[PDB]
Design a protein around this ligand. Structure first.
Ligand SMILES: Nc1ncnc2c1ncn2[C@@H]1O[C@H](COP(=O)(O)OP(=O)(O)OP(=O)(O)OP(=O)(O)OP(=O)(O)OC[C@H]2O[C@@H](n3cnc4c(N)ncnc43)[C@H](O)[C@@H]2O)[C@@H](O)[C@H]1O
Ligand SMILES: [Mg+2]
Length: 191
């Protein structure tokens, strides 16, 4: 039960808002264990498994993969690091209110949610630029629009939920990367 007593930080924001970017800075500075739902899912794809093929199809459409699948991947990763971790940074989960609730039922309660806030047009620009070079098949304009629609519909209520909980710190991800990280640092330092 090292885990349920562990420091757990949720990182929530739209596609291309800068979640991963900020999380890499957090890792370098604070040394937290970075668990990205996207990275865990893409790792399953990379394994060549039949599960991986199914997840790949879902992610290519810009849709949410089943709750149990991603939560179980995250839980397993947390357990594998429970003895050595300085704290957990959960990046890209939860993306619906039910994902937050099941995480609290099966794992533990977050002490902080970092709301990486960016405008829709900013996210589109960022993702199209990244899509010029990235290995992501979902960085195309049509799928980008689907990802955004899902974000506002399903994931923004997550932000509202943890605002009601009282643990959200909003960071302005339209500033320069280091400037955003200053706000991130402020929030983490106050823990
Ligand atoms: N919980 C879940 N449940 C069900 N399904 C799930 C799930 N999680 C994932 N899935 C499935 O997996 C798919 C992929 O999800 P996932 O990969 O987890 O989420 P994502 O939001 O699509 O991730 P991105 O990498 O696109 O965005 P990011 O916010 O991390 O931005 P980044 O820092 O890279 O930055 C983006 C660009 O902007 C640049 N940038 C960042 N910040 C700045 C800044 N301040 N100024 C200028 N440029 C910046 C960056 O250099 C970069 O080029 C989902 O669509 C879904 O299908
Ligand atoms: Mg990311």
């Amino acid at each position: 039960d090292k885990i349920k007593d562990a420091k757990i930080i949720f990182v929530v924001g739209g596609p291309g808002s800068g979640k991963g970017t900020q999380c890499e800075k957090i890792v370098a500075k604070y040394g937290y264990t970075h668990l990205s739902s996207g990275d865990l899912l893409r790792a399953e794809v990379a394994s060549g498994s039949e599960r991986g093929k199914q997840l790949q199809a879902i992610m290519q459409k810009g849709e949410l993969v089943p709750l149990d699948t991603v939560l179980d991947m995250i839980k397993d990763a947390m357990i594998a690091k429970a003895d050595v971790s300085k704290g957990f940074l959960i990046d890209g989960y939860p993306r619906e209110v039910k994902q937050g609730e099941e995480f609290e039922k099966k794992i533990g309660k977050p002490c902080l949610l970092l709301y990486v806030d960016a405008k829709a047009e900013t996210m589109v620009k960022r993702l199209l630029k990244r899509g010029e070079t990235s290995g992501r098949s979902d960085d195309n304009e049509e799928t980008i629009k689907k990802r955004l629609d899902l974000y506002y519909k399903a994931t923004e209520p997550v932000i509202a939920f943890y605002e009601g909980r009282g643990i959200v710190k909003k960071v302005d991800s339209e500033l320069a990367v280091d400037d955003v990280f200053g706000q991130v640092s402020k929030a983490i330092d106050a823990l």
